[PDB]
Ligand binder design. Sequence first.
Ligand SMILES: Cc1cc(/C=C/C#N)cc(C)c1Nc1ccnc(Nc2ccc(C#N)cc2)n1
Ligand SMILES: [Mg+2]
Lengths: 416, 556
Amino acid sequence: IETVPVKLKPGMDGPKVKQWPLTEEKIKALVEICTEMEKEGKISKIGPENPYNTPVFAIKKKDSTKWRKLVDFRELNKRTQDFWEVQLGIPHPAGLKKKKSVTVLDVGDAYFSVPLDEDFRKYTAFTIPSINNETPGIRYQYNVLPQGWKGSPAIFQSSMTKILEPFKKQNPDIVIYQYMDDLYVGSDLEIGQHRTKIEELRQHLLRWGLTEPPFLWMGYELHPDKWTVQPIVLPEKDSWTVNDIQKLVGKLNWASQIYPGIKVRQLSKLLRGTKALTEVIPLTEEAELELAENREILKEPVHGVYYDPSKDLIAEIQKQGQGQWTYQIYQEPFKNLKTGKYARMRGAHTNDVKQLTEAVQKITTESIVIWGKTPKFKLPIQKETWETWWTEYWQATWIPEWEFVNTPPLVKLWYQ
Amino acid sequence: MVPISPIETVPVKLKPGMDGPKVKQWPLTEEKIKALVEICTEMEKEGKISKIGPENPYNTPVFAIKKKDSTKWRKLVDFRELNKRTQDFWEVQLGIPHPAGLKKKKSVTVLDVGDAYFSVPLDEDFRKYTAFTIPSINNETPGIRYQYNVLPQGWKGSPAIFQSSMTKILEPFAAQNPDIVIYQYMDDLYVGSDLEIGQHRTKIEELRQHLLRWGLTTPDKKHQKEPPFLWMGYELHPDKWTVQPIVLPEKDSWTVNDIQKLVGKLNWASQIYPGIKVRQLSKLLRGTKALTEVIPLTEEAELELAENREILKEPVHGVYYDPSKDLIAEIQKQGQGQWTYQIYQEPFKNLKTGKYARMRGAHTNDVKQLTEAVQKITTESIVIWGKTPKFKLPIQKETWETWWTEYWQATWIPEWEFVNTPPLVKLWYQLEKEPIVGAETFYVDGAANRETKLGKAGYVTNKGRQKVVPLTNTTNQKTELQAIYLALQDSGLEVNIVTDSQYALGIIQAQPDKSESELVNQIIEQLIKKEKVYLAWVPAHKGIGGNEQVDKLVSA
Ligand SMILES: Cc1cc(/C=C/C#N)cc(C)c1Nc1ccnc(Nc2ccc(C#N)cc2)n1
Ligand SMILES: [Mg+2]
């Protein structure tokens, strides 16, 4: 009810980010949503003395038919002061990723109940553009904590902890973790029971509300305890061709950058001479032993892997074909913190870019659950293609950072 | 007296840490001073400026300029310093409407709102920074000091504040009259509709009555401007649009500047004249920027210019947008990295045209450029019409399928259909996924000495075929490519090639059909001739037979 003073970081001005082009459907959706938000006092029209801007668009959350406004506060988030005043920061819970079920709720509507520092409001300016720029874009700023701004959960946190207290006290084994507009609620209960607890939780928020959120009813269900990883595996064959052995030596050479004791001396010796690629070469005992020793090495964890919360997470993704995608998350090269593989890319059988967008969202979700932050993606796509399309397929209320890979990596082969 | 609503003031600040201007007034002749005194007395009578006391420390210089072929002086208050110190504003006009996105109108009326401009007050707290001084006759009295009460012409904030003030006033009128459009440009309002002329005139009179609520008068004697309108380099007509006349000059010789201007005109023309090309003319501007330098036109540039003159020989117009219909975009390949397109709704009635040029870079292929063109057109279409056109593309569906399923990057093009108009975009070669049984295996390698630049490239095969060639003025990377080229040259129609060159793999795996490198082009030419090629990579220096032999031969 009283505002928390907020500032930008020293020597930084507000965001001045261009609004990208919006489709007719998204403009119409935003005009309707913002007309309502304005009537409710959440946003106010602004004049030309505010030169700031942040882009806006609209999405549909997974399994919903109602449009949701999504502001891309990435620039404002980078520019906003850090919030350690009351708490150094809320230690990320390592137990969340160990729960049988985690449900993700959109609790962002709650933020609109708290007013935003009057002196900070100008930096939240955004524009609803018109088709062909025929009419002046409709300019607004926030009067209340905005969805998607990193300051919102930080300021609302004392309120959330109090709202959730009776539920936590009644359910001490439930893990609850807030990230931006998301609430992650984890338990080890039978799913039916789990859902009932989730709905109990919604009612606390609902009860508080009437003391109606458009997307709180929804629920994105995860089962992180079953998440699957991808160790390095070598082929098991009865007939090895020269080509097969060449591929194996390549893979092992690569793996030797990750694992110390890998050897290829005896395997390389098999190919002595200048042979046809399709010629079958029997493994010698010495080569079979070296292969076996390598397989054993690859069953052990990578040495010297640790998470440092002060460093960025980096995620690489490879397109493997036939709807399959591999990925790795690391902070230091060759020190993977997680690897994975997807094939279940939903409703995108003839659309690579939709598949990649879904993959990015899934990996970001995994990252939030495991470390409580988003990775910086290295995407196997041309900038222009990605930037034209990703907003068409986006269903999350956060947005990570990304860069583009323009030269094909050889590594694709080693995760295939 | 009928009460009028005030125009809400925009609060204005200087930039952080900046104070207002304190600029010396220049001396003026007695004649100029008398002129400025008269002009300012009238502005004062009109409420535009007010005399101020001696306490205000700010100043901006004022000048008197002679209105050509006249005995009348004009004042000029030079706000350059104040402008440097004034905050940034939101500028609504940055993106201008494209004519092709406009809708046909029966009537468009122009209303002069230049007088309204002076009912927009300047923020009281900012007025002090606009102070100026008329020097006194013979410097024998204090100069007459004034500040502005209204938006000064030439001040940084005036256009944004005027426009925003007018928009705020016009909003309710527009919202409650959805059967008209209103557009402000400079000192005029343009009001368009499809109403019968009597009703359109009624709406204009209603707009005039609305504006009077703020005491804003418009001229009874109707505007001299009427369609067609010359606006932002276009001609707008009630039911079609075009660019203003494009006249390419005749010259006996061309300078850098002439050519920059020529390409500029052609670029502007290309939004409605189909098929305009600028590659060969733009190549002439490479690297050099001495505007007076004379550049001889290449034969290729002369041909391009002649082709453009033929395209421009007579007027072409676009139609406006009918939101009830789909948009269709058709693209053609023109050669040398050039692409052209048309956007239409009904056959043979383009809304607009345009072009795309290949990006600068080492290697490329036609499918990638087509994809890029599609993305450009998509984004342009979202801006102008708020939707993606259906595409008609010169690439077979099977070609596209093969491309995207096998390409290492994610890629997508939106709903499209094949149009069989050559030249068609195709895939020129396709590497094998698996080694070829019965095909000879060539182990290739190259090396160069970094000091002498001497090197060697070659191969050894499982049939005992071998070759090493000594090379001059070369590099490790070039020798690695040369070795692959030799293997392609010397092999049959099916071939397995084993390389340790990560560089060469990175290139070939990108699937180029054209390169800035002649060597890469030679490799591409060979690949096109082959029936089957499998390219295998191995790590260098790892004891791999074949590889180890050839490495020794070329590193010697
Ligand atoms: C952008 C714009 C520039 C001018 C004029 C600028 C100037 N000078 C006049 C108008 C009315 C507009 N606004 C819109 C909006 C939607 N459709 C149209 N169609 C439209 C406009 C003019 C003519 C004509 N003749 C025909 C159709 N105009
Ligand atoms: Mg070598």
